[PDB]
């Protein structure tokens, strides 16, 4: 279950086959990593957008607790935004869909 040494998930414009595992209690959605930074290295709003765009749920309606940080516009440096193929993200609460 070492989702790190892969780099072969869902490819996009800048994202080199990078998708994150968005889990919600049991529900899981595949969302592409936020680019416009450094391909494998996403932006600070990455973890925030990953869970948000995962099902179209506003940030204040969920609670992202993963990647060694919390949901926000900016928390921990990008270098700690899960330096891998998206990493894993989970939120506690509900989801607006």
């Amino acid at each position: 279950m070492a989702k790190t040494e892969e780099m072969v998930q869902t490819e996009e414009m800048e994202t080199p086959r990078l998708s994150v595992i968005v889990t919600h209690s049991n529900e899981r959605y595949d969302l592409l990593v936020t680019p416009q930074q450094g391909n494998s290295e996403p932006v600070v709003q990455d973890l925030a957008q990953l869970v948000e765009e995962a099902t179209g749920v506003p940030l204040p309606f969920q609670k992202l607790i993963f990647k060694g940080k919390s949901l926000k516009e900016m928390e921990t440096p990008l270098s700690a935004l899960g330096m891998q193929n998206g990493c894993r993200v989970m939120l506690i609460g509900e989801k607006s869909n």
Binding site: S25, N26, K95
Partner: peptide, 24 residues
Amino acid sequence: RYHRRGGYDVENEEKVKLGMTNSH
């Protein structure tokens, strides 16, 4: 209810004695 998998299958439910579709 407009809640995909919340508490039960998807509706409000009256029994609510089986969290099989609580989130899964």
